[PDB]
């Protein structure tokens, strides 16, 4: 009688909290004592990209690691050369407010989303020369906040208005839908193997998603306030967030708990974006100081500085083979670091 | 409602409660063993050469 | 002087892309952007019918200035409205006349409120609009409303100096319509500091004129930011 | 996707002759254009060049003072103004279209050809291969040479390959040395290094019969190869 | 003359 | 009197210097910082050039005197030309920023229609022309007396006109208090034009006065012994220089943070 079934909530709620104190045994700050740290990183910037004229909200790297696309609110879709510093493609949206964009695993595909509910899908390789939308995924009750291609037929996204979706791009149609979200959900990451996917939320909170199956799995609870960023470890047994109260946080899977935070006493505003390099010995985050710290992501010890923005940092991605690192900011400038 | 949200809710949070954990002790050594075999794979963490730098004109 | 023959003929297209990124660009520079706010039982569906003749877009142009009006079609108003950070102004439309209904103007006083000190609104400036006057005149004369019964603080009041009423109406209406327009100046000239100014007006469903006085402020507006920058403001 | 050259016929020599190539089905404007001719008893050779925006031209030496070409963008045509015909102007021309990014197919669909009759340093290709005989069932090999390493500093090898089947027009089979273009099958497959090149069909359906031709894209002027004719 | 400047 | 005042030669290098190290640091941190690329920030760093010239070639004939006292009239020639020319390009940049800051306020809503950039480098381009075509033709006609006329016109209608401009905007700031002052709840635009116009004044001022003296009254015992302090109408100049810097670049909240990051 909506007192007494919530009465099992607590009743319930507490199993979990006191079975997470018995399968803790030490700290990852105890076992990462002994070892080295990596010194100073000192990267330079190598290239700068010119022409969005407006901010840009976006990026994403390509699987060739030469490719990328970005996204600015000035109603442009830009594809790079990002070894030459050519432009080779320049497509107009219909919504000059769009929050995502994505590419493609084969490089056939670009879509992107934003403050409009529908998430359009464009064809780089057409016959007749130019790039056309091939279409529009229509659903959602809200705007989209980001968006990861799976093949060339199949797309998840998430929404504001509390759920993901995961969609079948020859039909047009929602196939699987993740409820259980109580705010706005700003992120998601997809895993090395696409068959789990993980994803933040408004509600301070992170869930573990299956794809197959459609359902949640584990529920992680350790921010304080918004979280706007995600993405896994190149193992695939743990992740990391970004949120609003100066802070990021490493969470495990197999224990189901969060082991390490990334925190200084001098840094006060949010992270907006959170990107690993591969080995995951290096974590970076994009702050709203205009800056970019490297964080040591076994001993928590903050090990570089990528200054050199003059306006916040929206986004940054980590090439598939690991030689640069790409930053967006909202002075229009994108920048190729070491 | 009583038998449709306080109750969906129940089913979900005893779906989370039965699964299988491990120590934090042996996932922290697992996280450091998948670092010291990949580094010297790392062009950002060991700096590679000039010659092997496409972005370094 | 190193590049292949198809290298020179990609540098040729990237040089031919960025020319039409330029002039698209500055077709749109001295564009005026405007964000449409409400209550949703407020008239801004009537206000874009005055204006004009997922998201929703409105375009005019008047005196050869462009404009572009946007609206967005709840419990947080966060994560988007941090896209609207330089803009020219806020249009925010509130039915003056529903005090009673039960509480419809308390509640379009606590989001005034929530948007003035918002941090990404720093230097944002609200033209605000008070329709529904029509309904507002049948209510407080020859009706059973008495607005002391729902705010505590209308008792007293004495009509300010400043007020130039309409000619033809009773002084009842004049307290009346000048109390609620002195409701939001409260919070407007409370935490400004120089930076944005409130712009309160009266109109009721009929009146066409209200791309004048978007005009006219958004004149206001931008002479009032640069003067401060001078010193000599 | 179409182009049909129309304005050949016979030509007094020393008179003037225009050439129209009217194209339909694309994006006319972000493509660049070549004319490539062919005489009656030998094989494919480059003739002119104008790129995307009118902004570079190109010639070759034997016609360079005395042709002239021109585009008309937003009527989807192009021209190629002939002045001074002599004896050796007589062949079949050909309008090519070709667009250049990264990753891009160039010289990837040909026209049909007007006929040109008039009464009365370089790159060198090699082709040393009359003909060669088949059998629909075993693997066959063609090799080209060229006079200078056409591997470039940033990784490229700029050797194309093309089939002409006989009653027909060119068409792209290997771009790059290495890739596949659209709706060709798989057991085309191009190799080399250098200087030295091969081509390797499979197993041959009815349709391999032809002249094949190998092209370097390396510097201008363009310049093919003599041809080697499969036969049965 | 002018030391510094001119038409002193 | 009766004799020209002497003024050291230290002072003309000490003060050459502090004006080279301000005028520098401005437009380094004009070029490094994106949010500075505006119409406004060019006319400004055009002042800055146009400064420093003036500010090393007070300083090149100084220590020319020290090391050589009919092949120094050929350095008598160009020395002084430079200076001709960059004391009329410091004047039209002063000139330049009044007329930008007053399309901002009475074109207010179809400003960047008509200050782009391409009509930005146009002007900030063509007065650097005609002020180098004419620094020269001055100086080889400096024995006629018709030329006298045309430095003593292009200092007081550039006066005369920037005052204007300066007043009507503060006869525009004075309805804005009229109507904030009224909704429930001068003296800062008067000491911004008395510094603007004040140190034009101050220092610009006596030495196109000597010019009217000149022409008019060479024989005058009280003209005459106003134009014996020559020397001291060219440390005024050469303090304009200095104070430039300070009142309209470094007013902007912006361009601080950035010259502070640099030093
Ligand atoms: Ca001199």
Known sequence: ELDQLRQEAEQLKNQIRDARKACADATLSQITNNIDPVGRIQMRTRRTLRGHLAKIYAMHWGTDSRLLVSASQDGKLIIWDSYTTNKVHAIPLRSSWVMTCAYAPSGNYVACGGLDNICSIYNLKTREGNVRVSRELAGHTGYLSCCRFLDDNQIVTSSGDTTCALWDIETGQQTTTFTGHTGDVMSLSLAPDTRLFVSGACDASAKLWDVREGMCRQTFTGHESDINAICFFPNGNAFATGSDDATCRLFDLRADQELMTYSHDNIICGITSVSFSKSGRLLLAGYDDFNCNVWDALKADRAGVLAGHDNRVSCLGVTDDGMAVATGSWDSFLKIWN | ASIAQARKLVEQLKMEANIDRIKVSKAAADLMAYCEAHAKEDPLLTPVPASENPFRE | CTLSAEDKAAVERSKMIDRNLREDGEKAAATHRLLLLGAGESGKSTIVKQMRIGIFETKFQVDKVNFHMFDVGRDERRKWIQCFNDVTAIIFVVASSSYNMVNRLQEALNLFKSIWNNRWLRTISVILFLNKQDLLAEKVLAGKSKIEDYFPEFARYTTPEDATPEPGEDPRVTRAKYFIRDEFLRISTASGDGRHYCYPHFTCAVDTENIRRVFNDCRDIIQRMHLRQYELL | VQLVESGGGLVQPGGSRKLSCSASGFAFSSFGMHWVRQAPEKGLEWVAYISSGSGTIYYADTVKGRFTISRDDPKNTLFLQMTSLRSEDTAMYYCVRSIYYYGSSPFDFWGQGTTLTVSSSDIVMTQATSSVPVTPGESVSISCRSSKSLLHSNGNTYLYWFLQRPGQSPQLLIYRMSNLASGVPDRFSGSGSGTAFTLTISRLEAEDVGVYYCMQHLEYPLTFGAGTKLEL | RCXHXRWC | ?263
């Open chain 6, 1 to 263: 009197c009766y004799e020209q005042l002497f003024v050291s030669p230290e002072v003309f290098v000490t003060l050459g210097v502090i004006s080279l190290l301000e005028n520098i640091l401005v437009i380094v941190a004009i070029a490094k910082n994106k949010n500075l690329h505006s119409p406004m920030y060019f006319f400004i760093c055009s002042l800055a050039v146009a400064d420093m010239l003036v500010s090393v070639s007070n300083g090149s004939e100084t220590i020319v005197i020290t090391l050589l006292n009919s092949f120094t009239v050929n350095i008598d020639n160009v020395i002084d030309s430079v200076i001709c020319s960059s004391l009329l390009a410091s004047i039209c940049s002063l000139l330049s920023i009044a007329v930008d800051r007053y399309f901002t306020i009475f074109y207010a809503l179809q400003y960047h229609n008509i200050m782009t950039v391409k009509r930005v480098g146009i002007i900030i381009s063509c007065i650097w022309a005609a002020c180098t075509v004419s620094g020269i033709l001055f100086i080889i006609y400096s024995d006629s007396s018709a030329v006298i006329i045309c430095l003593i016109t292009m200092f007081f209608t550039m006066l005369a006109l920037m005052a204007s401009l300066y007043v009507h905007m503060f006869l525009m700031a004075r309805l804005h208090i009229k109507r904030i002052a009224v909704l429930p709840g001068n003296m800062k635009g008067a000491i911004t034009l008395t510094i603007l116009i004040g140190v034009f004044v101050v220092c610009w001022a006596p030495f196109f006065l000597h010019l009217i003296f000149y022409i008019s009254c060479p024989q005058n015992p009280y003209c005459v012994c106003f134009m014996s302090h020559f020397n001291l109408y060219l440390i005024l100049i050469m303090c304009n220089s200095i104070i430039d810097p300070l009142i309209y670049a470094l007013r902007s909240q912006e361009l601080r943070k950035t010259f502070k990051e640099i030093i």
